[PDB]
């Protein structure tokens, strides 16, 4: 019984990571299908097109700074 | 052509047409589609089926009427039906001979009768594969399948760097001969992966091979090769469906003579009639619902895996 | 000392998981017209970034129930 | 002990997280409607601020379900 | 054990959850619509305010569950 | 107390929020369509109320399956 | 008598819940044309109200599969 | 023991869940451009009717399942 | 016994979720059918085999849950 | 005694039922585009046959697989 | 125990019936691309099935790992 | 016991099966494109395909995994 | 316990895989997106490039998670 805790972690650990990557990568899809288009259209929006693009990226940053807070429990 | 090929070659010219100097698949599709065929479907019921659908269009030829069905918009009078008269006579020699290998007629006649049989319950002959005990051919027709994907991708890449050779096309004979270094080290490092005996010589051929893949990457200089042979190797492994149909097929038609032999089991004297419909009529159901993918994928497995190997499509 | 603990480990990452699948879902659409705003005008860029950022009180607050989990554990 | 606290954190994840993606899945063409809505206008934001913000009682709600289950723990 | 009462909070985390998650799903499209409305006309603000409002009855529905659930402990 | 009852409370919650999700699905298009049609023609709010409310039914079902579970609780 | 009432209450939950789930996704774009039928000319309300609730057979079954396990429960 | 009453229970509400699921997901399109058809024409209401009463196999094939399973309870 | 309910819970998933896959193909293709016989009405043949094609979907899923029925 | 061939039964079960929701995802599209295609020509009936039932390779290889499960039991 | 045998072919239905499922999601939008291209040139069959059966690799894959996972038995 | 030999073969049939759909979801709005940039015009064709199978790289780490998952078996 | 070392594989296999399925959710547009792009005009192949290869870190990321879950053994 003592070593399912730490699994239940690690599994735990692994959904939070996972299902934030999905969500940032949700973001992403229209995001930088708009930002292309942008960039396309005129050249001159790469910076917004790169900001709105790498914003959506704190989903993941906190899903990894979870992750690394149960990692830290063993 | 040859007259036994050309009916094949109204099946492969659907496609686009060969360019003058290169090696035309005619010849390749008599030998093995029929032959894939057969090893799918593999009962003698369903060949005499087929063989009954061949002898009427064979009518239709000799009345010299054509076969017009509005609802497909399809007409074709003389030669179209004699062809394909020509390919299903192939098609069900090939069917005949592989149910008497794999002991199938309609399913699992011999259930009633013992005509063919197993080891463990004995009949007047033996099943060579039974293909309905998963247990004892998984393995025996996965090697079959993986065999034969590897022979015709093999095929394929020794007529690409011949044509390479002919056209004095370096990039071209290079990428051909590269995919099929990459290729052996794969099959290779797969056989020391699963089933290794003989690990001394074998990491040797697996070094030899990707030693080759890497100096056919540099010097054709073409930077394809990395992504691809995940293509060809899914290409070689892509043959799996062949026993995978085959299966489904075999086992689909067994369960439903059992569940005909169970019914005229069950209500003994008045059940053998009403066994025999329901067995029949599921027969042609299934065959109306699935008969056409038995074709499709024997036929594709040439269309695709074989056909881009030398550049049919560019 | 047994499953518990692994379970609220479960639990915070649930919780972070779904409200981070959450606000990307708002995000998307959102960051899509944002970008196309600021493409057509480019005086959109308030009202943009705060609509982008708005949506980011869903993973506040699944951050907020991990921590509150992470002290309960 | 053992195992009740693990499930009620579970649980409690599970709903938070939910109620986030439902008024994530809300806002997304919500926001979408008022960014549009304000860069057609700007006189919009008003209407577009209180709609989007509108669908953020389904996290409250889940909020409160959250803390009554931690509560509980 | 009290492994009822944490199976119990589950139930009521999976029905408010769900709830807010059909809530949302409903609000996202009629919150569009009536955005759109509002920025056309503006005096149909009472029909999208009534229409928007009126699927919060699911989240109500739950929150009921999860009312009674949480004290059948 | 009783490991069968915290199952019945699952499933009890379970069947209210996944009926709460489906009248949510069938609200979205119901009521995107409704808002637009009074938007346009405002003569039909009560077709579109109709329309509207009638998939309540669906958590209605969802709503008496949960309170039978509850009664066996 | 002990676990199965608690696996037949989740077993009969999980047929409601998904039985309104796709009864409502149905009606969700039945009715959408349905209004916009209605709209466009309210003389087919008969059968937009008869292609709504066509759909309801589907609930109706997973009544009756609840019905039939709280019986057996 | 007597887990498996209550797993076939499990069993047989699954069935018919998603079997009544895929229908509703059919009858979703197929109702909507029915709709349609009869609004414009009128004479399309059999054509209509047969294709949206079709995908009721679906459901039919998981109520099979359902009985035989009760059957077995 | 353990085993049978597990194995109905196994017939239950293959049934419902290949039911699922035939209702979501008859979606789209059956809309198409009912756009195509409207607009024609001469397509119908064409159409009703478009939507009863992918019934060999739910008709495996039935072979699935009678074959767990069987060895059940 | 043990929960293996039940067990294997599920696993078996996933693999057909996944394997038929995916090339039912690719069969609505494809017969779709098929039955759009036979509509403005009738000659073009074979490449979307063709095209219509190339799909079937993912039932062929989950019943492949339920099958070699099966061969276990 | 039957544990690791029953838990091994569910992992390899899993993997084979998403590994489908993928094959299917891409080959629905690319063979609708396709039987469009082929209705419009019927000069594009080669192209059109070469990137229709590309993505087959997926699923061919998933088999690997379900045999080596059959070896693993 | 054999609960961890068959957790690991569920946990690499996890990561074959969703990276497979990944890669699949991905490659199926890139191959529409590719196939209606071939159709516009050939000598598209490298790029086209380049972009195809450049998400292939997500089916090639969850193979990795699972063959790390493998040797740890 | 061998759960132990089972689990962790279930973890790190979850791990990878969504965040290869999100990868792959932002590929499929963003490359369908940059294929576009490249047809219209074919000097937009670096920033199609870069726009592509940017949500890699997604995986980047998951992968990271799964070798430090490996780490523990």
């Known amino acids: ?74 | 052509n040859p007259p036994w090929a050309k009916p094949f070659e109204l099946l492969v010219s659907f496609l686009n047409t060969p360019k003058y100097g290169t090696f035309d698949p005619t010849p390749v599709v008599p030998v093995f589609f029929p032959f894939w065929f057969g090893m799918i479907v593999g009962d003698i019921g369903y060949a005499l089926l087929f063989y009954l659908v061949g002898r009427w269009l064979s009518g239709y030829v000799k009345r010299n009427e054509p076969l017009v069905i509005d609802l497909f918009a399809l007409k074709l009078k003389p030669q179209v039906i004699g062809k394909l008269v020509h390919i299903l006579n192939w098609m069900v020699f090939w069917t005949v001979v592989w149910g008497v290998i794999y002991g199938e007629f309609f399913g699992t006649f011999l259930e009633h009768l013992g005509v063919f049989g197993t080891p463990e319950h004995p009949g007047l002959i033996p099943i060579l594969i039974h293909r309905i005990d998963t247990a004892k051919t998984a393995n025996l027709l996965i090697l079959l399948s993986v065999a034969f994907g590897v022979v015709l991708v093999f095929f394929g890449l020794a007529l690409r760097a011949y044509l390479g050779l002919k056209h004095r096309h370096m990039a071209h004979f290079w990428e051909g001969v590269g995919y099929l270094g990459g290729l052996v080290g794969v099959l290779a490092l797969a056989a020391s992966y699963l089933g290794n005996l003989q690990a001394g010589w074998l990491q040797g051929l697996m070094y030899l091979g990707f030693g080759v893949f890497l100096l056919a990457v540099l010097m054709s200089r073409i930077w394809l090769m990395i992504p691809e042979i995940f293509t060809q190797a899914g290409h070689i492994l892509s043959h799996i469906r062949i026993y995978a149909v085959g299966a489904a097929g075999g086992i689909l038609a067994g369960l439903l003579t059992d569940v005909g032999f169970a019914l005229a089991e069950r209500l003994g004297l008045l059940g053998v009639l009403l066994g025999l419909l329901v067995a029949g009529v599921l027969h042609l159901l299934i065959l109306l619902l699935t008969t056409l993918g038995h074709m499709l994928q024997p036929i594709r497995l040439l269309w695709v895996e074989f056909f881009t190997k030398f550049g049919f499509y560019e």
């Open chain 1, 1 to 74: 019984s003592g070593g399912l805790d730490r699994g239940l972690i690690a599994v735990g650990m692994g959904l939070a990571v996972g299902l934030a990557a999905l969500g940032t990568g949700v973001a992403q899809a229209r995001i930088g299908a708009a930002g292309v288009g942008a960039i396309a259209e005129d050249r001159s929006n790469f910076g917004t097109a790169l900001i709105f693009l790498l914003l959506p990226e704190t989903l993941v940053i906190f899903g990894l700074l979870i992750a690394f807070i149960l990692n830290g429990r063993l």
